[model samples]
Target: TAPSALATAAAVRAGETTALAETEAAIARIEAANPDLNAVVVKDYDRARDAARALDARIAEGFDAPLLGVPMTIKESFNVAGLPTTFGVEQFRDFVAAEDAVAVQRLKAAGTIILGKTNVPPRPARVAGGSSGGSAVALASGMVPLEFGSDIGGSIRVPAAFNGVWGHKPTYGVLPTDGHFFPGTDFAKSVLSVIGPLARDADDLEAALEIVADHPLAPAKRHGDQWRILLLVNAPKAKVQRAIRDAIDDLAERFRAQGATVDTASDRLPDLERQNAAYEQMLNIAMPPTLATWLHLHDEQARMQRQWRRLFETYDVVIAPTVGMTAFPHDDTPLPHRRLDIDGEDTPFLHQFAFPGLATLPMLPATSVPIGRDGDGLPIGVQVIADLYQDRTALAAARAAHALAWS
Candidate 1:
């Protein structure tokens, strides 16, 4: 089993294990699992060993770091110095990064050893999910204890759900996006996406988030016995598979049994239909729109954010589906023409975007937690969304929900 990053670091600090030992163990695990999973597309074991030895030397001199000697991989999208970041494009296959991305630099300084890069828009066996699929798979399968990923849409959450792991999509701007540009562009960071961490343990996820955040985030306020939870069963025009919906419904009941308040619908919720339209427009902007149109989209997003803020004033968190169904078989059909067979009923595949849009459009923090498995034994997960900068609250609620579900 893969040890959590927190436990691994603590062990290293307490002299129970050496950095080189941990690094070697991680590399062996990756080698044994990668051929079947193909999750880690790029392997950098030699550099990783060198880095681990360097850290061991520092430790001998009484030096320490937060994630000191913790070994992990990052999404292929992030630029790591001396490593290629092609973003799945064949033409940029030869591209290499001269400097580390801001997130990567911070993670390295915090003492994480980069094992290499995971796939982006890459994978097999039910199609590992998306832009961040490789990172989620590596963690879920015990190749690594912690990983970093990006989310513009559901890149982080969906893959985490499909692979049965925990992932956090921080409130926009809470984390830096400096080195996560498009394939060949060095332009400014994109509008809605943000970088976050995924792990098998909540403490590891939370710690990694703090290590990479641009500013100090607020801690979780709602703790213990009582919590005000707003539950969104499904997004507008989105159809949830019975098994996924039932899993969340059961979790909500468990919260009630534990004395937490759960509400099915809220008038305070912003117009989901409108929010989805705006999010889609912003996400699918083909060419740069006139400055006025861009501003108008921003205006709509701001308005939605305001409504969500008001809702949070009455509720501690919003629990919803990360996606409607569990991981499906690999299908080569184009997205627009693709159809998802949910409970034996054909539904447009793009409609699932509605669930992820719930948090993405409002720039909210969402933590995707694996709740259970479907009838076919595939994994199912739900998201805990909190207001802007209340990422700790999202993580807190997610931890509680996970406890209730597994208990």
Candidate 2:
């Protein structure tokens, strides 16, 4: 049920199993689970089955494809050829793309069987809501083992956290975003939106990257005998939940045991709240002028960019809490459905974006890893962030940390 992408690929290549079988199993799982989870809103079982059988026949005829028979799901926002590419706006419910998004095309070329498109909140806003909500629900329900989701401000990571899976926001621009639908005019600045993976295993994250990132399967520099790490226990203007704080502390101990040099910073990074505030401001500025007029009057986008450009030079990797708390209930509140009583105290739902926004503002790569559970049996995760192109460093640290915990 949780085979890594590489493992699945190897199995298909070696003739140990057919892609058809994997696809059938995935479809069966989805049929059994989607009724309650509402993860997959669009179902294409007939198309998926035919494609899987065709792929199996191709493999039988002595053809080998990189992602042969691997069943995965895509975020709803991506244009997947015949599938509707609705970003959750009611008006665009009939909008369909004639071609696949660049990333989706690549996966198809590699022989990956896409089960269907998953859901997201309407208009991909904030970290916890929208089309990503669909992707998270799909993974949480066990419909599929892997998913392709995007994150502008934690779209991928937040859902992974809520659904109990692993997600990665790769270095910005490392993965292409050609066929996404955004309701805005300034397309250049909207590059912050990235397509990434959501999977049950950390290794599956790597496999998805291999098929998505600019360089797939490129071996990262392993964590050396001595590696440097910075721990941001508290972010400026943001309160860290006690459970999340303890999880980071536990992870730090694991890193120390692995012979890595860990340093803690007392002072907060320069105005993280302003950094996140700036991101929100830019989002409004980048919106259509009509929308901007109705929203707010702030032009802090330029200033925020200048501030973040200067902050990226300080650390090889910065570690912080993924979300202020754990998974929230599905509901229709204007705010995320996070109950204070659920996690023991009243917390600002917006605070969930604190750490995620930190890396997002500078357009850096960040990876989220499960750091055990909380008092309520919910999962907690930590973000390992790195400079623009050093995603491998962040991922290596995450893998090392995961290994230490397993050992």
Candidate 3:
């Protein structure tokens, strides 16, 4: 199931099987897994199947498309034309989208079949909750190999780390955000939120990047070895789990083996806490007064953003933890303020943002790669950061890390 999306596309492209068959299988898998995982919230089985059949016929007659019938899932936060783009809030549940989000339109134009929409945190603002929750679970459970998601803080990376999958938050504007109902497109000026891919395999992540890498509104430039790596170990108010730390160390060793220079840095790298603070401030400033007051304090927000902006000059790329700890039990209660108990010890829950905020605050690109498993078999991952518009470099680093670990 890792490369199912790409494999299906290749099969149909090579005339090995009809795209309709692949779409049917994907829908069936979602049906079989949805009950237990609650991943896919919206389904368009008949529509997807119809689209696939038409694409199959076209391909059979010698017409070809890049994705050509590949069935994939979209995060519920994105408008999917006829589907309701509810980011898990009850109020927006019936708000149907008149057109597709820019990223979704690009995928459709490339001939990708929209099997359904996946779940996400209620508002797509938090690190671990919302519409992305569904996408991550769907990809992990074999419902689909690839899904689309966006990250403001850790929306994409956290879910991928939680689900033991791969996710990339490409350089700020590599993927367009038109038609995205949440926060509006103008918000991009302050915080960078870009649509990205979530996949079970590393290669699929790369493929999706290529498809959505260039949007007329936000053109992304490609960068190579000129980029440098800065391993950020000490993040203010951030604590790295033992397993995740080991994974980072392993990755650094592997990079060294590949003849790349790697250096360990500390909290001095950037004022990530400040960036997150600014992000929280902006969140409060934009939301309803009551919600804003409850979400973040204005004074605290200003203090944090000021500190975070100081560290952007030194590193081209920064490696940090996605979440301080791994996935917690699925409970409806509010998340703990400090650390979540994995096997009975307390750890800082707020520390989860320490590393992720590094990229999130500056609206930079970040990619999360699964390096290994913890003692409990839960996945541990590391985040790779790149300067604005250097998403390909971050993605390439992620691929390199994945290869070394798996090989």
Candidate 4:
């Protein structure tokens, strides 16, 4: 198993494992696994080798780097110099960035060697689960322990949940977008999107979030109770699969029995049906019917966010299923046209977006915690959603949940 990024970096810094060794191990795994998973599409072996040698040399000079000697992969969506920034788009297939994206640059500055770019869907059959699917696959397949990916409409969490890894969708705008731009198009502010890290565990998620954050996002206060977590097993317009629901239920019971304040949701909370419906409307891919109408919906979303602010005052984190169901087979049928079988009923694909929408529209921090696998051995994850900038709180709560389930 791949060690946490912190553990890898610490060992490398202490001369227990050389940076070159770690880089080669990752390359070997990518070669061994990618043929089947086809995850690490862009191989940057030559430069990664050079970077590892260079990083090892710096360590000999007594230089201490935050992520020094760690090898990682970035989602193909981000601009990595010398790699296609296709984001799995057919038209931008030939687009290569001349400079590192701000996030990539920060990772480089912190002493990480980039292995290459990972893939996403193109014209996208399987919808590739948007945009960071490749990054997710690498982490799942053990090609790399750390990934930098973005999320807008589950771009990060969707793949993370499907692949059985930890993904963090940080509060939007917390990470900069200096190099993540569309080809032949000026930089556009993505509505309800954020760039974050994907890892096998929460430690690396916390470590990577610190690395890419535009500002120091260190939590102002650490907690004794850890979290007053609210359990949200049922979402609007959707009944989650039994395996997913069971995973959350088991977690709630464990936490509650262990003396954590765990409570099921109540009607007094904000309106999920209205908020989720508005979230769906705002996330429409094509142009809105009218700018005025879009603005009205935007205002409406803000109102819902304000309403949830009170709920946050009482609870530190709200826990829910990261994905409504476990990973299903990739089929010939396309999504939205394809249906997800939730609770023995044919459910629209839109319900899959509703859970993530809860935190996204409010720009809250949510960490996807992989609780365990189901009866068929598919992974199920729970989302630990917390107040904006309280990313540490969410991560801590996720760690607690993960520990209780396994212990």
Q: Pick the candidate with the highest lDDT.
A: 1
The best candidate by TM-score is 1
Q: What is the TM-score of each candidate against the true structure?
A: 0.96, 0.85, 0.83, 0.93
As for TM-score, the candidate ahead, 2 or 3, is: 2
- Give the per-residue lDDT digits (tens) of candidate 2, residues 49-148: 8989999888879888776778888877778777786555677777678998888888888888888888676531223443476776777666676778
| lDDT of predicted model 2 | 0.70
Question: How does model 4 score by TM-score?
Answer: 0.93
Whole-structure CA lDDT of model 4: 0.80
lDDT of each: 0.87, 0.70, 0.70, 0.80
lDDT of 3 at 220: 28
List where candidate 4 sits over 4 angstroms from the true fold. Answer: 89-91, 122-130, 181-187, 218-226, 285-288
lDDT of 3 at 72: 88
Clashing residue pairs found in predicted model 4:
none
Clashing pairs in 1: none
Per residue, candidate 1 scores C-alpha lDDT tens digits across 212-239 of: 9988988998634589998998688788
